[PDB]
Write a protein that binds this ligand. Structure first.
Ligand SMILES: [Ca+2]
Ligand SMILES: [Ca+2]
Ligand SMILES: [Zn+2]
Ligand SMILES: [Zn+2]
Lengths: 355, 355
């Protein structure tokens, strides 16, 4: 019971060998990642990486003959890109004569925080916020097959919104979003508070913030970010970050108080993704949700950045949960599904019982 | 030394397990084929077939652990379609820890008639005519890496030309071309001979024959094929087939007599493909080329229709020739090449020495 896992949906080519010692613990043997170089197609990249990225991951891992289950991403994404990992996984499966479990990409993200505790700590009736550079979704899980989208982005994601409006302020590094947070947190008190930069049910909107900041900048004193002093650009950065997060909080507060019947048994909140790394977002979440009466008490869990960002360990974990708790295996004639819905996880063709 | 071979370039999904008993003989263990149903994308078809088409081909064959070399089509064709076989072959290779040899599709066709005699009877300095529904090429091989295109189609192929102009005559079956030959050969003497239907260096042209037949039909008596008697449509079918073949012969006669230095050591002619099944084409080839003085004497070889039409056995054979006579193996980072030239066989990236 050594799980070979693959992630080939976006730009990250991931290969990870897991070790399931018993049905109570799951330490990770090996984990590889190769991202697309940018100033080369994603499908061609994955197709050229997967092969040599698995042999090295098998040479460095326990054994090449010790693999018992092959997990791969059948999930949402580019068909051509994820066919690279899928057809390769079929090749491993046929050659070793072992099962294949085609995993939903988003299911990996939602199930990943359960691996460390062997699906115990984030107990089945739970609620989750997926704040990344690509996602912005508020999901309620009732079981591994049941998932309810309570609030999702109709515009762009937080990562993009904070990176786009952050670029207007002057920041231009590798991870634009966190550099702004580090600038605000270098000296939180030294700000020009005088610079008052002041700006349906199941939806989030972010594409307006960049447009609203530019109008706020043209109305107020100066627009030239290069000439602007450090204290003034810090009161702007604080206020933009405050408004972006106030919108998320206000929509989570709206969801919880509107239908508390769905949240009667939720005892754990999971904030996963790139933006979860923000200490203000964390403190805002824990402050507001913990004081409201109608809202049920929570226990906030912030997973590591390695597991949060697209990796293969999550596919290997979600596959473990499906092979064990549902006892299902994907058919060998499996094909990529571009816009595979999460509720349409077991409705679509390809499932075969192992029980 | 059991070769797993794959063909996923066009519409035929092929998987074949070969048995190399010694470096003197090569009997074929298993061979599978699944073609695209037509009134479903070719890439999606190959991607869904390859997996289950290999497991059954491995269950019915000798063993699943007995495979020593993995041959696959890297050759010309649809990138998405042939990625299905390639990524799958990588999966087998990585899993079994065995070599991979990415084969040129056209090299399979040219090398296939050597398998039965273990590369002896069609001796190295040879000339070949590839007359199929997709090809119409006159190739000279000097070694397995050296190939000279002496005459090729600039329009459409013989198979298409005979099927398109045959359809104008009334035939509408599964294999249109051969049905016309069978109609001409049912009673070759009963024809209306009075119906005289009368119609640069390295090139063949066929798209003109259909247009020239229609003009010949409008000029002569009647066009309505339904009302037309069987004897008259037989003199048309004979004359169209005679003109199509006379053009091929005249261009082969031109090539040989223009540069006889290239043909000083050629002792064998190989006519392979769908149109090679025609007895008149065969008799025309053997008559004309055998009476001309400047042209070197030939020994005509007509391979079976199974090996001629797109299959995986040829990839497994061409791979055997490359692994043995050249001692080369393709790298695991291999990717599909859409318009891979035959002279650019070893010039392109991906080759690694096994010696
Ligand atoms: Ca099926
Ligand atoms: Ca290379
Ligand atoms: Zn993702
Ligand atoms: Zn072909």
């Amino acid at each position: 019971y050594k799980v070979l896992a693959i992630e080939t949906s976006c730009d990250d080519t991931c290969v990870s060998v897991l070790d399931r010692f018993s049905k109570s613990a799951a330490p990770n043997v090996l984990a590889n990642l190769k991202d697309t170089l940018d100033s080369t197609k994603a499908h061609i990249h994955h197709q050229a990486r997967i092969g040599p990225l698995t042999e090295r991951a098998l040479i460095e891992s326990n054994a090449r003959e010790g693999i018992d289950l092959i997990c791969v991403t059948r999930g949402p994404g580019m068909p051509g890109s994820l066919s690279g990992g899928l057809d390769f996984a079929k090749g491993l499966a046929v050659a070793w004569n072992k099962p294949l479990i085609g995993v939903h990409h988003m299911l990996g993200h939602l199930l990943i925080p359960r691996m460390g505790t062997n699906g115990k700590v984030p107990q089945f009736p739970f609620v989750s916020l997926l704040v990344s550079g690509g996602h912005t979704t508020f999901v309620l899980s009732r079981a591994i097959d049941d998932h309810e989208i309570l609030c999702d982005t109709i515009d762009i994601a937080v990562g993009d919104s904070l990176d786009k409006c952050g670029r207007e302020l002057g920041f231009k590094g590798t991870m634009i979003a966190r550099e702004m947070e580090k600038f605000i947190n270098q000296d939180i008190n030294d700000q020009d508070f005088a610079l008052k930069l002041e700006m349906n049910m199941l939806s989030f909107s972010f594409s307006a913030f960049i447009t609203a900041l530019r109008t706020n900048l043209t109305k107020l004193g100066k627009t030239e970010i290069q000439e602007l002093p450090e204290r003034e650009i810090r009161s702007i950065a604080y206020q933009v970050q405050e408004s972006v997060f106030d919108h998320i909080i206000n929509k989570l507060k709206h969801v919880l108080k509107s239908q508390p019947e769905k949240f009667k048994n939720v005892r754990e909140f999971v904030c996963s993704g790139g933006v979860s790394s923000n200490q203000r977002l964390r403190t805002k979440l824990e402050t507001e949700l913990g004081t409201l009466n109608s809202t049920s008490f929570f226990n906030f869990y912030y997973p590591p950045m390695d597991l949060c960002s697209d990796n293969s360990i999550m596919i290997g974990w979600a596959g473990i949960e499906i092979w064990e708790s549902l006892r299902l295996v994907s058919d060998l004639d499996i094909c990529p599904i571009r816009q595979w819905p999460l509720n349409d996880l077991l409705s679509v063709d390809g499932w075969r019982t192992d029980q």
